[PDB]
Symmetry: D2
Subunit: 114 residues, 4 copies
Amino acid sequence: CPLMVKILDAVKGTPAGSVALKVSQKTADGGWTQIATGVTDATGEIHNLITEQQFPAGVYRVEFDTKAYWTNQGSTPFHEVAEVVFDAHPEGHRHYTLALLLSPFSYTTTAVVS
Amino acid sequence: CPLMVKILDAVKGTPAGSVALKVSQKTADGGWTQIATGVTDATGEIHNLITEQQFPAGVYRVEFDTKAYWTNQGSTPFHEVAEVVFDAHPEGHRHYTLALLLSPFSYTTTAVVSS
Amino acid sequence: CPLMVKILDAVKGTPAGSVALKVSQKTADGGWTQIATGVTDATGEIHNLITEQQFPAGVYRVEFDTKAYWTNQGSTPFHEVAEVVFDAHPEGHRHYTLALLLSPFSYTTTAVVS
Amino acid sequence: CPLMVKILDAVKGTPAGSVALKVSQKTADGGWTQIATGVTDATGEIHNLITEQQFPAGVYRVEFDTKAYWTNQGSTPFHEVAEVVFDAHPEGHRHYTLALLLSPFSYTTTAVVS
Ligand SMILES: Oc1nc(Cl)c(Cl)cc1Cl
Ligand SMILES: Oc1nc(Cl)c(Cl)cc1Cl
């Protein structure tokens, strides 16, 4: 699994379950095109989010639907979305874990690359 | 000024000076219209980034060129860019401060919103 | 004002008012001596917490009562306290700002040094 | 194990390997008693840091030697140490995971409880 996520809820002290996300690829032209979607399970993770064949070198954007998550928790969020934009396999294939720490008016995006 | 930023560098323990950013406004069709650009000063701020009149209610996107910042600092960063997207309702002298804390492989974005 | 703080609330998107904190100075024998206490105003700051004369070089500890901050809002927090421990002026006098970003189960502590 | 840690390096984008830490239990007299030491493996973790027998309800301190970590990485750090203090099993017994995101001048401490 070349692309993994781990989302934590800083209000409740649990993983953030049922967070919807979208994975897009940047075109040669210059825009975005959506290639996969997923929803986190109760551990804040998504297994088999994409295949290694869907994940060639290039720039990708992962859009986390934090607004819906907080709304479904009964809280008022600030951000309309949380976007993580990165160049993948710039100099050699490897595995990516996007860690995301959520609060209604704040998030922290970190990356663990192996 | 209804929209301020504060950017800090978590490696050096200073504000992040000379960071370029773009402010865009979501249009009715769902695209984006650029409405301002700026570069942080040595305190990590941009004074008078936009006027009250340029900042009506709606969705905005603030795009911070952190890649260039880290490259110039001599570190190889993870993120191509940092984007903060939010719905503004700037009724009643309601001000937004976007705080951003930068690390080469991490950032934290928070907002402070007045009343 | 060599020692300043800026505390923010990541749940509601405001500065964290009425946060009590204590400043202690490490002693030769390894112990801690309290030198100042204070409470953040509504901007999340404390003015005139200590003087330059009270702030010689050495190890300090700033203890933030985050538990009461969350308890008094009716939320349930994780940490008993937030403690920021640092060596001050190890290469000369400076000015120190401790920024603190608070959520019930998380905080981020950063320093701005001049 | 009832107490796990996960330490990430936000400069390199990897787990923080070989971080030393100490676990202490607050005593009735307001002091601290050390109950364990440990050192993270290359995944930023410590397997079996303590046992259930060592973990009655009460306040605990986990002290992470982050200064030595950054010194070895060849960076100049701000904090002397990173300290996490929390009340364990306040409303009954729980399992705890402490997440720590490290930068030379910043850290984020988060908790995942049960
Ligand atoms: O298992 C985990 N992994 C990561 Cl990467 C984080 Cl940030 C937090 C936890 Cl609990
Ligand atoms: O004025 C400010 N200063 C600092 Cl240091 C932070 Cl983190 C946030 C704000 Cl709004």
